[PDB]
From a paper:
Having delineated the MRS subregion suitable for introduction of peptide sequences, we produced two additional constructs ([name]-PMI and [name]-[name]) using previously identified higher-affinity MDM2 binding peptides. The affinity of these variants for recombinant MDM2 (residues 6–125 comprising the p53 binding domain) was first measured by fluorescence polarization. Both variants showed high affinity to MDM2 (apparent Kd 28 ± 1 and 25 ± 1.5 nm, respectively), comparable with affinities of their unmodified linear and stapled versions. Whereas the activities of [name] and [name]-HA were similar, [name]-[name] showed ∼2-fold reduced activity, indicating auto-inhibition by the [name] that is relieved upon MDM2 interaction. The reduced activity of [name]-[name] compared with [name] and [name]-HA along with its impaired Cu binding suggests that in the absence of MDM2, the [name] helix reorients itself to block access to the sCu and T1 binding sites, most likely by packing adjacent to the [name] α5 helix. However, in the highly similar structures of [name]-[name] and [name]-12.1 (Cα RMSD = 0.22 Å), the MRS-[name]/12.1 regions were not resolved. The rest of the [name]-[name] structure showed high similarity to both the MDM2-bound form (Cα RMSD = 0.3 Å) and native [name] (Cα RMSD = 0.37 Å). As the [name]-containing MRS retains some intrinsic disorder, a transient conformation likely inhibits [name] function, with all or a subset of the Phe, Trp, and Leu residues in [name] contributing significantly. The reduced T1 copper occupancy observed in [name]-[name] likely accounts for its reduced kcat, with this phenotype contingent on either all or a subset of the Phe/Trp/Leu residues in the [name] insert. In agreement, [name]-[name] meets this criterion (kcat [name]-[name]/kcat [name] = 0.32), and MDM2 binding results in increased activity.
Numbering used by the authors: 29 to 379, 402 to 519
Amino acid sequence: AERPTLPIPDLLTTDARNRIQLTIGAGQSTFGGKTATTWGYNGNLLGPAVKLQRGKAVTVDIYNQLTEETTLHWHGLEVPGEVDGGPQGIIPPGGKRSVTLNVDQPAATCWFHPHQHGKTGRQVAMGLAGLVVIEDDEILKLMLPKQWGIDDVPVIVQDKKFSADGQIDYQLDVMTAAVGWFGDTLLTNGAIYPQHAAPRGWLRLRLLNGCNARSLNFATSDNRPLYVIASDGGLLPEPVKVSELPVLMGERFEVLVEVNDNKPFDLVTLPVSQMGMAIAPFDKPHPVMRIQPIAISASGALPDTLSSLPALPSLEGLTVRKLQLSMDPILDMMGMQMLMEKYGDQAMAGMFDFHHANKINGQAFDMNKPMFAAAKGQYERWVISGVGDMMLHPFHIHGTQFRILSENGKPPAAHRAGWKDTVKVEGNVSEVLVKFNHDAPKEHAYMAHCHLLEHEDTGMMLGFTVKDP
């Protein structure tokens, strides 16, 4: 009858021993009345919100209760490579690995997910993702909405496709290696079109695009504005009012939205210009969740000023690193053909071993050979080109929060000008200003890769190390 309520990830903080336990395991979820095998952190699906504090360290004990290897990448955390959880962070099935997270970065919503070599897309599709809520001394002074699960709410948005038996229907084949794995069912914290009761006043949504390959574009059903207050790596200097908010795979934004009177409204996602992603029902605005106003306590506010953003340093004398993304023309031809044959023209609306056909600087990912050594504690200019390549590539660099200088041909939109760990590359060139505060040796290198997961799984990744020059 009624919509399910929005599931709220548990806020998970350290214990008296300053430890946090994460169990990775297989269970069961229900989607549209049909049960499915799913994977989760501390549960059947998705995961908790690990809560960290700047200036404090926590030890996370990770128990892998799957029957296959996995890793745990702390997406957005400025931590050394040894705990970064790239493909070299193997956790054996039935085994346990512990990492120390010594947090030293501004308040932010980050997240965590597998980075198993060649299998990251499958493991995310099966259910593995969690959140990270970093707080500091600055953000709690602001009196933003702060009641977790009431007026401060995480919103993890993901698509899946299921086979007739109800099971998740994941495949890494020549089509998905080209355009990505995408589905026809939209999930919001694991539920289909849930409702969230929100007190009158301001509602804070921590948005995460957790799709393998689908880009999203958030808006409200009645075109009330969203006020962006934070990006991947934390607060903007001041709120940025937008009518729609595109969000790439793996990106987070925090928005405030007004909840007035008592009329419900929807958070929705608007059709995107991305290949494969405008097939019905995604050819039209698609609801994400229903917001239901209520009359309980809430004192959160939208501040005029949020934080201070340092100036972009001088580009003069900085090391420039060039990263050329590419796809084997045969993969582009064959994958495109299969997409068009199956879905037809709508797959372009609004516009052979494939396992190593996606590449950076002419090379599919080689775990034994980091491509370069970056300087610790020094700004570098990284130039990432998708010239000659049709596809969307949200490009993620581990171990940093960087500043976008140029995004795919233009300066970043204001709400994208702050701290980011992902930058858009699509048929043009992006430039980012990056600094690495922590070491990563050859045996636990940082990754830089496309976050369209099927591209990463088929080669579009490089490792790099960081050491004091």
